[PDB]
Design a protein around this ligand. Sequence first.
Ligand SMILES: CCCCCCCCCCCCCCCCCC(=O)OC[C@H](COP(=O)([O-])OCC(O)COP(=O)([O-])OC[C@@H](COC(=O)CCCCCCCCCCCCCCCCC)OC(=O)CCCCCCCCCCCCCCCCC)OC(=O)CCCCCCCCCCCCCCCCC
Ligand SMILES: CCCCCCCCCCCCCCCCCC(=O)OC[C@H](COP(=O)([O-])OCC(O)COP(=O)([O-])OC[C@@H](COC(=O)CCCCCCCCCCCCCCCCC)OC(=O)CCCCCCCCCCCCCCCCC)OC(=O)CCCCCCCCCCCCCCCCC
Ligand SMILES: CCCCCCCCCCCCCCCCCC(=O)OC[C@H](COP(=O)([O-])OCC(O)COP(=O)([O-])OC[C@@H](COC(=O)CCCCCCCCCCCCCCCCC)OC(=O)CCCCCCCCCCCCCCCCC)OC(=O)CCCCCCCCCCCCCCCCC
Ligand SMILES: CCCCCCCCCCCCCCCCCC(=O)OC[C@H](COP(=O)([O-])OCC(O)COP(=O)([O-])OC[C@@H](COC(=O)CCCCCCCCCCCCCCCCC)OC(=O)CCCCCCCCCCCCCCCCC)OC(=O)CCCCCCCCCCCCCCCCC
Ligand SMILES: CCCCCCCC/C=C/CCCCCCCC(=O)OC[C@H](COP(=O)(O)OCCN)OC(=O)CCCCCCC/C=C/CCCCCCCC
Lengths: 23, 99, 49, 269, 69, 119, 50, 185, 74, 99, 65, 75, 75, 75, 75, 61
Amino acid sequence: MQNTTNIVHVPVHMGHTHYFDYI
Amino acid sequence: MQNTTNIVHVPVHMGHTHYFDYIDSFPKLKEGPTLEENHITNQKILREQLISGQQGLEQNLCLRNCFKLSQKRYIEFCLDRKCGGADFQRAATILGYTK
Amino acid sequence: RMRYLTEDPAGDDPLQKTKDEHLVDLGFIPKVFGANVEVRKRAPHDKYL
Amino acid sequence: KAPGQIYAYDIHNTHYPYVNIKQDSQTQLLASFRRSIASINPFSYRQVPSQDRAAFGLRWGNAWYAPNPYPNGIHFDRVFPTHYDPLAETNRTKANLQLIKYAPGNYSTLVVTSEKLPRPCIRTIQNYRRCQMVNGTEKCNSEAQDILAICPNWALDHMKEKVRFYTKALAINNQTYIRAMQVEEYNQGRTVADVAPKTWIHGTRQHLRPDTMWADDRYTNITQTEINEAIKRVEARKAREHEKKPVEQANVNANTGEQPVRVEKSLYP
Amino acid sequence: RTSAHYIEINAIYGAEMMKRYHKVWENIIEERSKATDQEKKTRYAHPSYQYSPLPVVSIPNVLNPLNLQ
Amino acid sequence: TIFAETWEASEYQYRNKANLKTLPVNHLGKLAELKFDFVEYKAHQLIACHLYERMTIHCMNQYGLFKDFYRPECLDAQYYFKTCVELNAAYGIQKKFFPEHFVGSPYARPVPQFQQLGL
Amino acid sequence: NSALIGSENQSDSMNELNTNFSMTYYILTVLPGKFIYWIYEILHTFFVVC
Amino acid sequence: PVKEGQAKLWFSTKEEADAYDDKMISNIELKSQDYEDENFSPVFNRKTQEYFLEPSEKFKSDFAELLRPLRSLSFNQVVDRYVLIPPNHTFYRNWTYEKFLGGFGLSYLILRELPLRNFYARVFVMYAFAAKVLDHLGNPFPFSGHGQIVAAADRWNHWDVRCYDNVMKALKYIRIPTVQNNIPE
Amino acid sequence: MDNYFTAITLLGLRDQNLPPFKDARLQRYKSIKKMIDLIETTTKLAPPMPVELFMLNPTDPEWDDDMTYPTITH
Amino acid sequence: TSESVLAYDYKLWYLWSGVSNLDESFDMFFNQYWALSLSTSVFQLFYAVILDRYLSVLFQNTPYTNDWFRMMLHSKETALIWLYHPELSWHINGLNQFF
Amino acid sequence: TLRAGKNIEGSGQVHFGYHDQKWGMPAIPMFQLMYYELPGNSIVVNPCRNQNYRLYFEMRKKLGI
Amino acid sequence: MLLVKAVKVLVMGGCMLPIAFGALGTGVLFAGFNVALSRNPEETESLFNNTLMGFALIETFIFMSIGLGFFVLFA
Amino acid sequence: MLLVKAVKVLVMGGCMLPIAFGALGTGVLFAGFNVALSRNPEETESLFNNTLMGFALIETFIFMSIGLGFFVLFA
Amino acid sequence: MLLVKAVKVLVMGGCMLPIAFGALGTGVLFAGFNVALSRNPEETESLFNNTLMGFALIETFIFMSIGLGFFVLFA
Amino acid sequence: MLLVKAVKVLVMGGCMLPIAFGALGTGVLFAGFNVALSRNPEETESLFNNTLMGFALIETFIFMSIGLGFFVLFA
Amino acid sequence: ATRWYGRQPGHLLRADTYWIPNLVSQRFAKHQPAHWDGTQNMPIFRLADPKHKDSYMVQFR
Ligand SMILES: CCCCCCCCCCCCCCCCCC(=O)OC[C@H](COP(=O)([O-])OCC(O)COP(=O)([O-])OC[C@@H](COC(=O)CCCCCCCCCCCCCCCCC)OC(=O)CCCCCCCCCCCCCCCCC)OC(=O)CCCCCCCCCCCCCCCCC
Ligand SMILES: CCCCCCCCCCCCCCCCCC(=O)OC[C@H](COP(=O)([O-])OCC(O)COP(=O)([O-])OC[C@@H](COC(=O)CCCCCCCCCCCCCCCCC)OC(=O)CCCCCCCCCCCCCCCCC)OC(=O)CCCCCCCCCCCCCCCCC
Ligand SMILES: CCCCCCCCCCCCCCCCCC(=O)OC[C@H](COP(=O)([O-])OCC(O)COP(=O)([O-])OC[C@@H](COC(=O)CCCCCCCCCCCCCCCCC)OC(=O)CCCCCCCCCCCCCCCCC)OC(=O)CCCCCCCCCCCCCCCCC
Ligand SMILES: CCCCCCCCCCCCCCCCCC(=O)OC[C@H](COP(=O)([O-])OCC(O)COP(=O)([O-])OC[C@@H](COC(=O)CCCCCCCCCCCCCCCCC)OC(=O)CCCCCCCCCCCCCCCCC)OC(=O)CCCCCCCCCCCCCCCCC
Ligand SMILES: CCCCCCCC/C=C/CCCCCCCC(=O)OC[C@H](COP(=O)(O)OCCN)OC(=O)CCCCCCC/C=C/CCCCCCCC
């Protein structure tokens, strides 16, 4: 199973930016 | 957890030899009859079965094939249709399935 | 609060936990409970984050 | 002793249908020329398989054709997060080693399969059932112990879990039965006698008008005058229906530090 | 490995038995076409079922929707 | 069965197994690759697997099934439609008899009753 | 991996069916065009930065 | 005025029907193409007929053309024709691939003898010929990878290895790894 | 999304078009929820038929030969 | 293992695309009964249920339900029989459950 | 192993953790005399398979061939 | 829908812009040819040939526009 | 949405503007070439080559324009 | 968004205006190079290099516009 | 609100107008350089040094426009 | 339990001269007093998490 797998219980919005991945 | 881990239920004896790891023996291993002895022993069974065990066989084969079916209701149908109106318990006693 | 509510899947190995097949042979028959589907996870006060 | 031909050979009647998916003039003209000389052309390749000769698939120019893999958002980054969206491009771009790795099974579906239990374990199960229907359950202890001993433990676990699954599916099917056989308030006291002599076609567009204004020529002769009058009648009925309105309920998801309820989303933002 | 005999013999067995099922399937549809709505809704039905006639409607008896033999 | 046009992706991802496939929404970009003229209503493009079905019809009407339907824009629609209904049939079954496998289900990681805590 | 010698990255598209919808004769038509654009990006850069 | 047709409504009483017509008529927005009209719209003129997707004649004619050899046959003839093909495993089925791919080598024999005078002009020809091959072979280096050929699917695919079970699992099944990351027991 | 063709057929998409507004279009989806539970239950009432009809029992000792496919290495 | 290896090889791909009428991967039943359900008919809803049961059969890729072992109504050979006897989906779903 | 249902973190056989390694036969005569690599061509189908041809010889005689 | 059609026909009218510039460019070219001929009339044939050639290139743009015009007008 | 498509085809018409300036620029180029030839006819071949070369640079803008047009028309 | 996007793509069409003026500036430049070459052919190579050199300043504005075009088209 | 935004971007397109005239002004400046060079090449350095200087002032205004362009787009 | 405790993000200083945008922007920033609210976890700086909106430029490996 994927090592970078997380289950979150509250909503989050991710940035749709190039070269970056964040909330 | 070690990847090369195995749980064995029968005794094994491992050889304590340098550079090698293997099972050199099995405790209380009995050498049975040779392949030639079993061959001769089997030929005596096949010879008798060939001379005295070929009469009335066509009926027994139909009974055996009927009992290889999935459901019981299909067996009774096979017996009545193919085996000439045979009985379930009476055929099971011939085949040796009854206690 | 999000990382407090960020859990990982599957928890821990159930085989490292007490078995129900063993409690029976020990003298205690466990009672089977249902899943609690009405509870909502929430974060504590900020002082405990 | 003629070779066997597949059903596809009787649709085309030839083994050399030069099907190329590339819709360029150079390709379709060459295929028409190659499609005509395939009988006496040494550079001919089959595309319809047979019992005596295998065949090739669909051609893409000089290369071969395969459909675009069904969109799959699963990907694996190497250098930087790419945010791969399978819906942003028509054809999936090739996977560069330093950029992305796509999920396995470019052409794969989801199925359910089962392992085949060992043959000796199967024979012990056959002997138990056979002795069961013949001699009864109470006289099958020896055949039951042979199962627990000869069948490896991984098989007994499978057998143990099959019973729990089918027990689960049995309930899931009976719950649907209960919801299906429930009598609603709009069908209380109604039986087969109160059913109409109608079939599926009677609920179609020819017999049952859809809930749209331009499905047929029903409202094609309506004028602006008739509309203004109709707006007055609907407003008249609203003088008696608008008297009631549901009360506003509390927001169960008011606290942001609480696991929100997956409540039905609003029709509009 | 699974016996190659079974794989090939069963492939022929299944087809030789389907040609015989097609003929049996036709005789059953024919005998059922000459059956009353009451008989075809109570025969092979559950004992606890009470038959209640339904309104008669026109539903053709077509063997194969596709015009096949 | 899905009784809406939109579904939460996380509800169709596994919680205790590796996620190798998603259940994506219809690929509206494939609709612009049809070279011929056609009429499509926006009210039918979101429901699962139906867009690829209507496109296959449009392509089977403009072209046929022989030597003209065999173009990339039309075969990908037929393959998508056939693949969409197979995946959705399996996911729907897996949701019916294996709801504990998916995220959002309270049985994937059951929360215990207070009687099991010993307080 | 089609440019690697004795690749061991069997999970990176080596054991998968990988077709495309580009022009064929890839190394004669497509791959040169990528190098042509490469030469433009770098010549436009040199002329600009210089 | 309201027009009647073959398509009828789904209301028992006439008041509910009139209420439905009044609801739909109150939502009509007429768009006329003629000037001097209170409801005039040069662009954005709404159509007054709804389009319905149906299978055309070209659609239904080609699906019936696929079944032409089946209408002339009986079920027993169809099985004996396309299903019960007499087993004959003596043919060299893979000759189709040998001829096609072997033609590259035979073609190189004739192509390496081109009377082109300039050595660098034949460099271009062989570069184009290698491109034709590399569309199938993929990697030019040896002991690196495999070629890629899409072949037709028939009942004789893997016909001589159907008896082996592990070959089926490796080709067909892509198993999903679990949290307890292990091969099935 | 199982029972696709059944649901698409009940919604009428084979003869008509859905309403262009979300309010009514969504209510039409929830209207078939009962019928799907019904048609699925009906499909689970099929009576049994002999398995040994179009399929030989693979567990029969006749198939213990584990025979291979003889080929010709052309 | 260590065996003979070749410098250059070709790997075939018997793709089951389902969109090619040139080979046996063409699902004739699905495409015929699907187009049959598009035209207004009294069995329009019945054909839909049939197609849904056919998809639940492909979903069961067991040793007793698969093309590898040439099982009836699962292999490429018997794909046409679906056109004559689509009622056998229930028999298949039950048979696979029995074994 | 990946296709069989086991995801793989990292790569290689130089196990960082609690596992046994096997480095490869040292290319010196000492190990080249004790060990030799597994020849795949020596793994064979059991010849008992050929005993199923007895069924064919008996059928040919039953049918009068 | 109907709007984009009005834009297409409008663009089709735009093609008359090069038709205007081509007219002026022709007058300019022949204006130079007249003067150029007076400067060195001994080679009238050379100037004359080069003159018409330029005009051919001028109208080339015209056909490209008209062609492109009908393209967007029907594609 | 629909209007975005309309402005796209509208822009595609704008590409006919360089087509117009390219015509005038060509006429001017050949206008000077004529007078230039009369000044020094001894090098007619050199002037001629330079004439067409410059024109090639003009058509570059042309292909560049229509290229941008067809791109924005479809992207 | 879609409304502003419509004028965005329209602005991108404006970038084809320098594409027009750049063509005319080219036709004019090579014209001066030709006439100037005739007056003093002794320094042909010098003039020739300066000609193309000047042209480089034309495509300067071209790429700058297209760059600014796609930029505002997305920024 | 959304309208003024659509105008803000629209103005930003107008900034490409000097980008067009700057190209034309260059071809004219370089044309005079060639003729001026062919006239008296002995004084190239002086004639040349003044050429680039003028061009520097030319594109300076071009950059200046882009400044005001982004200003009105964000101010 | 160990994985859960590890996701509780640590405190990472906002001061950064390695990212040129912060090297410029922070020269104009005004340092205001952070009045203690009675806790030991006041996130008056950025957080040591890759998904934080002020730490996404940092490479956590
Ligand atoms: C009594 C009469 C008896 C005779 C009568 C009959 C005579 C024969 C009639 C012919 C019948 C039809 C032939 C069918 C059989 C073809 C078999 C075959 O192998 O074809 C494969 C070949 C490749 O197709 P394919 O592999 O099946 O792939 C399918 C799709 O292409 C795949 O789609 P895709 O889009 O993915 O593919 C991309 C596309 C890319 O798009 C392109 O096609 C590229 C086009 C760009 C170049 C176009 C210009 C070519 C000509 C320029 C010369 C002009 C000179 C004059 C200029 C005057 C200006 C006004 O295609 C390619 O990339 C192809 C690349 C391979 C070719 C390039 C390398 C070739 C080497 C050339 C060196 C020549 C040196 C001399 C050697 C001679 C001996 C070998 O097919 C062809 O290319 C057909 C060629 C047809 C000829 C066209 C006209 C050529 C004119 C040349 C004039 C110069 C010579 C003068 C001779 C004068 C003689 C009098
Ligand atoms: C950088 C400098 C250089 C650039 C210069 C040029 C820039 C050009 C780019 C455009 C600039 C932005 C302006 C766009 C306006 C929108 C136009 C449009 O889409 O048409 C729809 C528009 C309305 O459609 P409709 O048929 O009335 O709809 C009836 C339905 O019942 C309606 O019911 P429904 O239920 O079907 O609803 C449909 C839905 C559809 O929704 C949409 O599609 C959205 C439409 C986009 C606009 C929506 C936002 C509007 C916000 C209001 C603020 C407007 C500010 C304008 C600022 C102007 C800048 C100076 O809602 C609408 O109907 C939207 C109504 C659109 C009204 C547009 C605002 C009217 C402007 C009032 C001033 C008129 C000045 C005319 C001067 C003409 C001089 C030649 O059609 C017309 O207006 C027809 C033209 C006007 C009638 C007189 C005939 C004039 C013929 C002129 C021929 C020459 C054309 C130009 C040649 C140029 C080269 C020589
Ligand atoms: C009395 C004097 C004579 C007067 C008569 C003169 C007229 C003669 C012609 C008419 C009679 C011909 C007889 C045969 C019927 C063929 C009819 C036909 O349409 O063929 C078209 C034929 C096949 O069309 P295709 O379907 O497009 O297949 C070619 C594709 O490339 C295939 O693409 P693919 O990807 O689908 O397949 C790849 C391909 C591999 O294909 C390739 O690798 C070639 C790719 C092209 C090269 C790559 C660069 C791309 C070049 C593109 C530009 C080429 C333009 C050429 C235009 C030519 C226009 C016709 O591998 C294979 O698929 C299997 C091939 C191997 C199968 C077995 C072949 C057996 C041949 C038997 C030879 C017997 C003769 C002896 C030979 C000489 C002995 C010393 O196309 C050709 O023109 C092939 C040219 C090969 C060169 C032949 C050189 C020897 C010719 C001998 C002539 C007679 C003896 C002369 C003695 C000298 C004193 C006289
Ligand atoms: C500090 C600077 C120095 C650093 C240098 C760089 C370091 C190295 C970098 C390495 C880079 C990575 C290497 C590539 C990665 C992939 C490796 C791989 O997968 O290989 C697996 C592959 C598996 O084989 P294996 O694991 O070693 O053995 C298992 C099996 O036995 C194998 O299969 P089998 O069991 O079926 O084979 C049975 C055997 C059957 O043999 C027999 O039964 C008896 C022997 C009969 C020999 C007949 C020869 C055939 C022709 C005879 C015709 C004339 C007849 C004369 C009279 C005959 C008398 C009977 O057949 C043979 O193998 C014959 C081999 C013949 C070799 C020639 C004999 C002399 C030994 C070689 C000396 C030269 C190399 C040393 C270089 C030293 C330089 C310092 O390895 C190879 O055997 C192939 C070797 C070549 C691999 C490298 C290819 C690299 C690609 C680029 C080069 C392409 C070649 C272009 C040459 C151009 C020359 C101008
Ligand atoms: C002078 C003759 C010299 C020959 C070489 C000397 C040594 C001879 C060794 C003989 C060994 C014979 C052992 C048997 C080998 C079996 C070969 C084989 O299986 O081929 C089968 C198969 C038959 O097809 P099926 O119908 O599917 O199979 C039916 C089986 N009854 O044959 C083939 O594969 C077809 C290809 C045959 C070989 C290649 C043919 C081309 C030969 C190239 C040279 C000819 C050039 C001129 C060709 C003219 C072209 C216009």
